[PDB]
Curated annotation (Swiss-Prot), chain A:
Origin organism lineage: Eukaryota, Metazoa, Chordata, Craniata, Vertebrata
Intrachain disulfide bonds: none
Phosphoserine modification, residue list: 28
Alphabetic keyword roster: Acetylation, Cytoplasm, Diamond-Blackfan anemia, Disease variant, Isopeptide bond, Phosphoprotein, Ribonucleoprotein, Ribosomal protein, Ubl conjugation
UniProt-recorded name of the protein: Large ribosomal subunit protein uL29
Entry-linked InterPro entries: Ribosomal_uL29, Ribosomal_uL29_CS, Ribosomal_uL29_euk, Ribosomal_uL29_sf
Subunit relationships: Component of the large ribosomal subunit.
GO BP annotations, alphabetical order: cytoplasmic translation; maturation of LSU-rRNA from tricistronic rRNA transcript (SSU-rRNA, 5.8S rRNA, LSU-rRNA); translation
Curated annotation (Swiss-Prot), chain B:
Family, similarity comment: Belongs to the eukaryotic ribosomal protein eL13 family.
High-level lineage: Eukaryota, Metazoa, Chordata, Craniata, Vertebrata
Subunit structure: Component of the 60S large ribosomal subunit (LSU).
GO biological process, any: translation
Disease entry from the Swiss-Prot or TrEMBL record: Spondyloepimetaphyseal dysplasia, Isidor-Toutain type: An autosomal dominant bone disease characterized by early postnatal growth deficiency, severe short stature, genu varum, platyspondyly and severe epiphyseal and metaphyseal changes in the lower limbs.
Keyword Ribonucleoprotein: yes
Protein name: Large ribosomal subunit protein eL13
Domain of life: Eukaryota
Function: Component of the ribosome, a large ribonucleoprotein complex responsible for the synthesis of proteins in the cell. The small ribosomal subunit (SSU) binds messenger RNAs (mRNAs) and translates the encoded message by selecting cognate aminoacyl-transfer RNA (tRNA) molecules. The large subunit (LSU) contains the ribosomal catalytic site termed the peptidyl transferase center (PTC), which catalyzes the formation of peptide bonds, thereby polymerizing the amino acids delivered by tRNAs into a polypeptide chain.
Modified residues (Phosphoserine): 51, 76, 105
Tissue: Higher levels of expression in benign breast lesions than in carcinomas.
GO CC field: cytoplasm; cytosol; cytosolic large ribosomal subunit; cytosolic ribosome; endoplasmic reticulum; membrane; nucleolus; nucleus
Organism: Homo sapiens (Human)
Cross-link position per record: Glycyl lysine isopeptide (Lys-Gly) (interchain with G-Cter in SUMO2): 122, 144
UniProtKB/Swiss-Prot annotation, chain D:
Binding partners and assembly: Component of the large ribosomal subunit. Interacts with IFIT1 (via TPR repeats 1-4).
Family to which this protein belongs: Belongs to the eukaryotic ribosomal protein eL15 family.
Protein name, entry field: Large ribosomal subunit protein eL15
Portion held of the full protein: 70 to 204 of 204
Gene Ontology annotations of biological process type: cytoplasmic translation; translation
Swiss-Prot record, chain F:
Matching SUPFAM superfamilies: Zn-binding ribosomal proteins (SSF57829)
The protein, known as: Large ribosomal subunit protein eL37
Stored PROSITE patterns: RIBOSOMAL_L37E (PS01077)
Modified residues (N6-acetyllysine): 9
Its job: Component of the large ribosomal subunit. The ribosome is a large ribonucleoprotein complex responsible for the synthesis of proteins in the cell.
GO cellular component annotations of the record: cytoplasm; cytosol; cytosolic large ribosomal subunit; cytosolic ribosome; synapse
PANTHER family documented for this protein: 60S RIBOSOMAL PROTEIN L37, LARGE RIBOSOMAL SUBUNIT PROTEIN EL37
Record keywords, A-Z: Acetylation, Cytoplasm, Metal-binding, Phosphoprotein, Ribonucleoprotein, Ribosomal protein, RNA-binding, rRNA-binding, Zinc, Zinc-finger
Naturally occurring in which organism (per UniProt): Homo sapiens
Encoding gene, per UniProt annotation: RPL37
Sequence similarity: Belongs to the eukaryotic ribosomal protein eL37 family.
One Gene Ontology biological process: positive regulation of signal transduction by p53 class mediator
Pfam families attached to this UniProt entry: Ribosomal_L37e
Phylogenetic lineage: Eukaryota, Metazoa, Chordata, Craniata, Vertebrata
RNA sequence: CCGCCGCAGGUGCAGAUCUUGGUGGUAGUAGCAAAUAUUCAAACGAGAACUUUGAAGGCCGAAGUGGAGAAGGGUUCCAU
RNA sequence: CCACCCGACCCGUCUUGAAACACGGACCAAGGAGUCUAACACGUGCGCGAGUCGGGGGCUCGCACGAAAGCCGCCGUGGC
RNA sequence: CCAUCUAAGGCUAAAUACCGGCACGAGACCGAUAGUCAACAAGUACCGUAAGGGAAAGUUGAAAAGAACUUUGAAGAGAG
RNA sequence: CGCGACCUCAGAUCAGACGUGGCGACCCGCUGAAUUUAAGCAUAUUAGUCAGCGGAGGAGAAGAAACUAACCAGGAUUCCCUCAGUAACGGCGAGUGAACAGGGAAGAGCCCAGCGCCGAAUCCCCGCCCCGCGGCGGGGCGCGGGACAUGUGGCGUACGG
RNA sequence: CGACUCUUAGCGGUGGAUCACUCGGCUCGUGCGUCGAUGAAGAACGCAGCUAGCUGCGAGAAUUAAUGUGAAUUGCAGGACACAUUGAUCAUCGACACUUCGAACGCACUUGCGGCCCCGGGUUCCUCCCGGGGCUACGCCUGUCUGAGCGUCGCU
């Protein structure tokens, strides 16, 4: 049949691995057919199976990582791969809370002397 | 080599001048960019004057220019003290303050003191809370008269 | 005259974008006029040509009234093959001759869910522009 | 001072440039001390330094360093300036008190060499030929 | 030489695999200008230099 | 004998392939590369050769990661989000 | 690039050129000399109402 | 067999053993000039290579 | 693609032992002369002074024109 | 194209003097050398004139042309 | 005598620069010996131990319709 | 003897973080020629330039006077026009060469230490719970730990407080 | 009488000028102005059914997911559940993936040699062997633990 990532979403971990195994077995047979003569139909199935394996593996990896993110959600420390990447320099910049910190002296100035809305008559 | 009658010239072209030549092909683009920034700033700060805060009258120094006056950096602390304006408040309401300037003569001090008072009459002060006004300009005054004063404030 | 500063009028640029356009853009480039009856029926002037569309060749040596089906849209070559638009190779093999889709007129459209969605978008917009011109 | 590090004292030039000894470094030994402390501790920011002693061969300075990623530093708005990336290796760009003393900065008749921010900035401005569009 | 490191042997492997003529069907493809492999190395004429 | 005859005795390699830059300039006895300066931490680069600088500068390779950063910049380096499902 | 591309013209001389150009545009002999096909034009200068 | 260059004789023996459900007596590996690793996998005497080749599809 | 009125310039070649590309006379010329040597028959083949096989006459002559390696080469190895 | 009569040495160059037993040039094609910037002088053209000049800036709901053009005047600061 | 500031601690946007980079627009520019070295599998082929040096090279046709078939030749190559 | 406190040190694959290298047009800090000009040449010039080294950012650096002036005075920095090829420097040769005032572009000001007063009133880390909630945190608690009187924080900085 | 030679024209060659063309430069301008121990720049090797270069990519290798799009891709072939509308292709790209060397990180740079922890197998019940996973670089900050000192002291 046609392997679609949509169908693999609901499948369990065990049967996802089993599907991966059957595809890997089939690809090995196709590679045998490549060197043992082999019809054009068998050769052209190599790409179909190869991409089918990638489709199954992507679903497994995507499922496995999102489970980690749910487990590590709310934890103080998370694995580096599960952390925001962005750029090294953006990761090393002050956080929004630190950037919004004001000294009491600065807070007192803003309270006492706020910028006023005014107009001047010509 | 000189030839017949001519001026003795010493052109300052013995360094690698060709490496440091500033052309002005972005001058039209620079003028456009400055104009747009001026317009953007004016829209942001409306209805406050576009040019900026009011500046004082100062007399230009040296014998070459002491007959002329111009806009100064900011009103001195003595001028603000006589006018009755707190130095911290002056900046919020659009008055430039220059703590470095000292008034040597009373004529200059009175000229700027009068300038500050006349500015204060012309000022329309919007309340911080539109619903609740305390010591701000009248609703009628704010509603119609307020408009962005283009050009230097009280040239 | 063009006024958009972000749209180029450069001959080299427009030729470069045209001859290196990806296939999905080449689909739009390969649009063809609808027939008068189709234009009146759907209120649409032009559609991107599709395989299994009946067309008339209206320019070139194969111009005529014959209705032929589009059998292949070779976007890489910017040309389409029509079922009776062929010629005789030396050895006797019959090969289709490529016709640019702007030189054919669609007489029958291959309607499916996507074409019907596309047609009702163009007609809604053409009509909305009338609510402008008026 | 700073001996000219040429092999066997040979400079291979005109006599004006034949000097090897009696030469002086442009920056002070306090500036060099800050540079050494800053280079060794690349993860810290050099704030200032002060003298603590000297003998005939050595001068001793104590450099104040700040860790720019400690919370007591990043959560204090008065010291948040040192945590910004533009303040990386201030001692290596002549931005500490000891470093800036050698740049010729200052206000007035004495400091005309560095109008524009640096001696290089002033030299560039004064040696750039401004060719306007309309001449 | 018969004595060779793994890195040098792997390097010589890539150079042998690259030294092949173009497939004949490359020429039939649209917009083709490659009429023959211009990067063909002959062991006796031009040396790898390693 | 300094010419043709002396050319026959060349059978020992001064340089080999560098493990950092891939050029065949890794001096074996000196254990240093005359191209990139390996094993020095910093890359060997001189303003006296602009040609040499442009032969290996940023841009002559793959950009396996930069050309992803250039793409991600145009959207503000967003992460942790996906387009709405269809 | 630092060739002298641009040129200065005195404002008075620029204004004189506009005056001469306007004066010549009112002379049918000079407009026709520019191949402007005005043989059926009612008048020179040609003025039309402002609702245009 | 043509095998991955990363693999060693222990891995090749273990892979062949339970890919094709046979027993292996000896593994001799070489790296051919095109950079591939070729493994000569000699099976146990009870297993027949011709029989296994038929099940694989080699012949 | 050009005429006319103006505008602008990287605007006119025989030379620079000029630069790059091409082409001649020389000229079917000089030359294909270091280390003794080839011959007969057959085969294959469109085609044989030169390939192969057989026969003959020779040479290297064990410090080899023999048999194997190191370095270097890197597939040149082998078959078709 | 050819014939005949009279005339007729190979150009470029340096040079007092070149057909020179002075140098460069086998041949052909294409490329190939007083430019541009700043300054100054004088001469000529144009505008205004005891003045003259905005070149820097600003204004005109920037933007095909238009990066142009127009305007400023308590923008003439300043230059001459 | 007077004037003027208050060193030897620190922060700070704008106006400014930008022959690298990511996108984009334009030109009285060049037009394959020109324009970037590079319009092409170009920093490629190739050279050098190496640092480094570094090319040449665009165009069938509207569409391959890229010349079936006959004939001479071993074929390249011809004649129809 | 030993048991403790502190000080000065050391080890750890200790818990959690941070630096390295690249690019380098523009920017900052150093180092730094000679060709060249002077019809020779050594000071000078080239030039604080090329090459060399280090450090950054989207700008950098500079920056709120130990300023300019000498006027009826101006008033942080940077950039533009002008000042000006000027004052000045110079085998006073060749050559070199700023600034202040004026007009503009932009315009923004501030914080400590000290000196005092407030029962350290201050900060970091850890554990738990509640709420916004991709870790950004807010609060509450803890006879939890540590920093800190060799001085944290509030107030206050030459315009005075 | 010819050859031979020269000149001029026709045609044929040789050569690639000229003209026309231009998905390329050059110059100016504008907006933005973002790399890296969460492994960059660069290098190596590998990856397509037929594919060597260029390009693209990383053992999921000329691509996976997703979103948009809406019937192709194409030099040949193959697949009607691999010839698909239940989504071809292309674009976008936020998810996943991402070999070796490289600041390059166990040590060394030979695919050379270790150490610690966990899992599976060798009937493992020890040693040991094989496979797999995690970790093991330098500097530095805060904090912790373990300590050193005829450094300064207190108590006994
Ligand atoms: K050997
Ligand atoms: K001569
Ligand atoms: K001659
Ligand atoms: K899709
Ligand atoms: Mg305070
Ligand atoms: Mg302004
Ligand atoms: Mg162009
Ligand atoms: Mg020297
Ligand atoms: Mg110096
Ligand atoms: Mg800064
Ligand atoms: Mg600063
Ligand atoms: Mg200064
Ligand atoms: Mg100058
Ligand atoms: Mg050889
Ligand atoms: Mg020699
Ligand atoms: Mg050696
Ligand atoms: Mg072996
Ligand atoms: Mg031209
Ligand atoms: Mg010329
Ligand atoms: Mg010529
Ligand atoms: Mg001549
Ligand atoms: Mg002969
Ligand atoms: Mg001979
Ligand atoms: Mg003999
Ligand atoms: Mg013998
Ligand atoms: Mg002998
Ligand atoms: Mg003579
Ligand atoms: Mg002569
Ligand atoms: Mg003679
Ligand atoms: Mg001579
Ligand atoms: Mg000659
Ligand atoms: Mg010519
Ligand atoms: Mg005149
Ligand atoms: Mg005027
Ligand atoms: Mg324009
Ligand atoms: Mg204008
Ligand atoms: Mg005047
Ligand atoms: Mg005046
Ligand atoms: Mg501060
Ligand atoms: Mg041409
Ligand atoms: Mg070229
Ligand atoms: Mg070239
Ligand atoms: Mg740790
Ligand atoms: Mg660095
Ligand atoms: Mg740029
Ligand atoms: Mg001289
Ligand atoms: Mg001379
Ligand atoms: Mg000399
Ligand atoms: Mg100097
Ligand atoms: Mg330099
Ligand atoms: Mg950056
Ligand atoms: Mg700035
Ligand atoms: Mg102050
Ligand atoms: Mg000033
Ligand atoms: Mg003057
Ligand atoms: Mg002096
Ligand atoms: Mg100087
Ligand atoms: Mg000034
Ligand atoms: Mg205090
Ligand atoms: Mg001809
Ligand atoms: Mg030819
Ligand atoms: Mg997909
Ligand atoms: Mg070894
Ligand atoms: Zn290297």
């Amino acid at each position: 049949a046609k392997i679609k990532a949509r169908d693999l979403r609901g499948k369990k971990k065990e049967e996802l691995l089993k599907q991966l195994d059957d595809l890997k077995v089939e690809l090995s047979q196709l590679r045998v057919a490549k060197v043992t003569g082999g019809a054009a139909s068998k050769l052209s199935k190599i790409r179909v199976v190869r991409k089918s394996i990638a489709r199954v593996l992507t679903v497994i990896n995507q499922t496995q990582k999102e489970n980690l993110r749910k487990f590590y959600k709310g934890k103080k420390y998370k694995p580096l791969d599960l952390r925001p990447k962005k750029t090294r320099a953006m990761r090393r910049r002050l956080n929004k809370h630190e950037e919004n910190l004001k000294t009491k002296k600065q807070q007192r100035k803003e309270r006492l002397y706020p910028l006023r809305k005014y107009a001047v008559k010509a | 080599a000189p030839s017949r009658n001519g001026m003795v010239l010493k052109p300052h072209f013995h360094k690698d001048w060709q490496r440091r030549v500033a052309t002005w092909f972005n001058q039209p683009a620079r003028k456009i960019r400055r104009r747009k920034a001026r317009q953007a700033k004016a829209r942001r700060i409306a209805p406050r004057p576009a040019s900026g805060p009011i500046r004082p009258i100062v007399r230009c120094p040296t014998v070459r220019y002491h007959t002329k006056v111009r806009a100064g950096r900011g009103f001195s602390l003595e001028e603000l003290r006589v006018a009755g304006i707190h130095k911290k408040v002056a900046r919020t309401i659009g008055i430039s303050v220059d703590p470095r300037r000292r008034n040597k003569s009373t004529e200059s001090l009175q000229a700027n003191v009068q300038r500050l008072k006349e500015y204060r009459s012309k000022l329309i002060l919007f309340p911080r809370k539109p619903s609740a006004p305390k010591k701000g300009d009248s609703s009628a005054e704010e509603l119609k008269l307020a408009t962005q004063l283009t050009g230097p404030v009280m040239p | 005259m063009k006024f958009n500063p972000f749209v180029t009028s450069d001959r080299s640029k427009n030729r470069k974008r045209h001859f290196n356009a990806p296939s999905h853009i080449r689909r739009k480039i390969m649009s063809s006029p609808l027939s008068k009856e189709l234009r009146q029926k759907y209120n649409v002037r032009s559609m991107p040509i599709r395989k299994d569309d009946e067309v008339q060749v209206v320019r070139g040596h194969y111009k005529g009234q014959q209705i032929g089906k589009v059998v292949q849209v070779y976007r890489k070559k910017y040309v389409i093959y029509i079922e009776r638009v062929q010629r005789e190779k030396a050895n006797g093999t019959t090969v289709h001759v490529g016709i640019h889709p702007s030189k054919v007129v669609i007489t029958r459209l291959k309607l499916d869910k996507d074409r019907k969605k596309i047609l009702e978008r163009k007609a809604k917009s053409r009509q909305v522009g009338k609510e402008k011109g008026k | 001072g700073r001996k000219r590090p040429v092999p066997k004292g040979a400079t291979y030039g005109k006599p004006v440039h034949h000097g090897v000894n009696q030469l002086k470094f442009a920056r002070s030994l306090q500036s060099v001390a800050e540079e050494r402390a800053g280079r060794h501790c690349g993860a810290l920011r050099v704030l200032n330094s002060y003298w603590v002693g000297e003998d005939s061969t050595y001068k001793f300075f104590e450099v104040i360093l700040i860790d720019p990623f400690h919370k007591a530093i990043r959560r204090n708005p008065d010291t948040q300036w040192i945590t910004k990336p533009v303040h990386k290796h201030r001692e290596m760009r002549g931005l500490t008190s000891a470093g800036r003393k050698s740049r010729g900065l200052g206000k007035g008749h004495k400091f005309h060499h560095t109008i524009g921010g640096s001696r290089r900035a002033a030299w560039r401005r004064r040696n750039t030929l401004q060719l306007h569009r309309y001449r | 030489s018969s004595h060779k490191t793994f890195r040098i042997k792997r390097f010589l492997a890539k150079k042998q695999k690259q030294n092949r003529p173009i497939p004949q069907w490359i020429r039939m493809k649209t917009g083709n200008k490659i009429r023959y492999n211009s990067k063909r190395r002959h062991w006796r004429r031009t040396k790898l230099g390693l | 004998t300094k010419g043709t005859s002396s050319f026959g005795k060349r059978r020992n390699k001064t340089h080999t392939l560098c493990r950092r830059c891939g050029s065949k300039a890794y001096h074996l006895q000196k254990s240093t590369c005359g191209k990139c300066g390996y094993p020095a931490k910093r890359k060997r680069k001189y303003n006296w050769s602009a040609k040499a600088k442009r032969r290996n500068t940023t841009g002559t390779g793959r950009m396996r990661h930069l050309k992803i950063v250039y793409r991600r910049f145009r959207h503000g380096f967003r992460e942790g989000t996906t387009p709405k499902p269809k | 690039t630092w060739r002298r591309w641009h040129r200065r013209v005195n404002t008075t001389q620029k204004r004189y050129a506009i005056c001469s150009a306007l004066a010549a545009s009112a002379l049918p002999a000079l407009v026709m000399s520019k191949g402007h096909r005005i043989e059926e034009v009612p008048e020179l200068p040609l003025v039309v109402e402002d609702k245009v | 067999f043509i095998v991955d260059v990363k693999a060693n004789k222990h891995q090749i023996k273990q892979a062949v053993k339970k890919l094709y459900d046979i027993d292996v007596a000896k593994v001799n590996t070489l790296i051919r000039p095109d950079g591939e690793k070729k493994a000569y996998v000699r099976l146990a005497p009870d297993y027949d290579a011709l029989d296994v080749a038929n099940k694989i599809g080699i012949i």
